[PDB]
């Protein structure tokens, strides 16, 4: 496949990693009696470990000669779950914070003491604003084609140079 | 002085004339003379890496005796610059002209020695031997 990689369910070296990770925890398990808390903890760890290899095998990830999963970010839609889909997710949450935080500064600006409300949050007002950023791509778009997103060039102070 | 002055002509003439006596003395002494253990090195175990040519190859006793004999005449002169007599000749400020014509001639031979060695593949004592 891409870059001469093989899928992880068919990699001979990915399977060896699964065995040696389980063998290491089994040889630690043998020094304890079967009902005790260290034996139940290591038994639960080998279940977590065994479920970690099974998950990847059917995942659809690509392995190398090293036996480790690789990620593809060319833009292929077949490997979307690797970068695109968690990427769109992060953009939604990061742009949500920046939008909401900016709404707050603009709101408390027209006031006697704007600086007072940055060290001591008006929580009822802040709480209201935080959840209005769920539709930010629409709200950031309405202000771009209004004139309320970016200011004019005669409103920004500039260094003597330019 | 410090250049082509009259003084520097007088001092270097006095070194040439003294130098001819040093070259002719060896010429008599390396050329069938009493130099002992002339061509055998010093000891690395005794003198060290100061005495070596390359690796541990040490200078011979011939080269050491001649170099140390030059340091005998050097050090006593070095006194005469640093603590000169109130009546002596000063640096860095049968009685006459006789120095100025011998000491010219004595400076003329040494350069004509070095011509007569770079041509004939002959060390400087063989040409003094040919001149006797």
């Amino acid at each position: 496949d891409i870059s001469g990689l093989t899928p992880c369910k068919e990699s001979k070296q990915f399977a060896k990693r699964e065995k040696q990770a389980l063998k290491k925890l089994q040889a630690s398990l043998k020094l304890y009696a079967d009902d005790s808390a260290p034996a139940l903890a290591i038994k639960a760890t080998m279940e977590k470990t065994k479920k970690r290899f099974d998950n990847y095998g059917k995942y659809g990830l690509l392995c190398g000669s090293d036996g480790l999963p690789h990620l593809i970010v060319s833009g292929d839609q077949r490997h979307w779950g690797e970068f695109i889909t968690p990427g769109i997710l992060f953009l939604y949450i990061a742009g949500w914070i920046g939008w909401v935080g900016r709404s707050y500064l603009i709101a408390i600006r027209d006031e006697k003491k704007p600086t007072q409300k940055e060290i001591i949050i008006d929580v009822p007002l802040a709480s209201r604003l935080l959840f209005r950023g769920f539709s930010w791509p629409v709200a950031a778009y309405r202000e771009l084609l209004n004139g309320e997103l970016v200011d004019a060039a005669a409103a920004a102070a500039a260094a003597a140079a330019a | 002085g410090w250049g082509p002055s009259v003084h520097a002509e007088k001092w270097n003439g006095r070194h040439a004339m003294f130098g001819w006596f040093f070259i002719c003395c060896t010429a008599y002494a390396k050329g069938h003379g009493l130099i002992p253990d002339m061509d055998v090195p010093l000891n690395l175990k005794e003198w060290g890496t100061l005495a070596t040519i390359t690796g541990k190859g040490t200078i011979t006793n011939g080269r050491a005796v001649i170099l140390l004999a030059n340091a005998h005449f050097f050090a006593i002169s070095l006194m005469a610059t640093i603590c000169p007599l109130p009546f002596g000749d000063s640096l860095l400020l049968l009685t006459e002209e006789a120095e100025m014509i011998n000491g010219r001639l004595a400076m003329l031979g040494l350069i004509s020695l070095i011509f007569a060695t770079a041509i004939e593949q002959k060390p400087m004592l063989d040409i003094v031997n040919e001149w006797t």
Binding site: - | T52, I53, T54, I59
Partner: protein, 33 residues
Amino acid sequence: MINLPSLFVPLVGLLFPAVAMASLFLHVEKRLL
């Protein structure tokens, strides 16, 4: 010759810098120049 490095290296390593450090000292501390 094969005898040259035992002549130049004290001259270049000890003698030349002692003359050069002496010369610069006299020049740097000379008032009208």
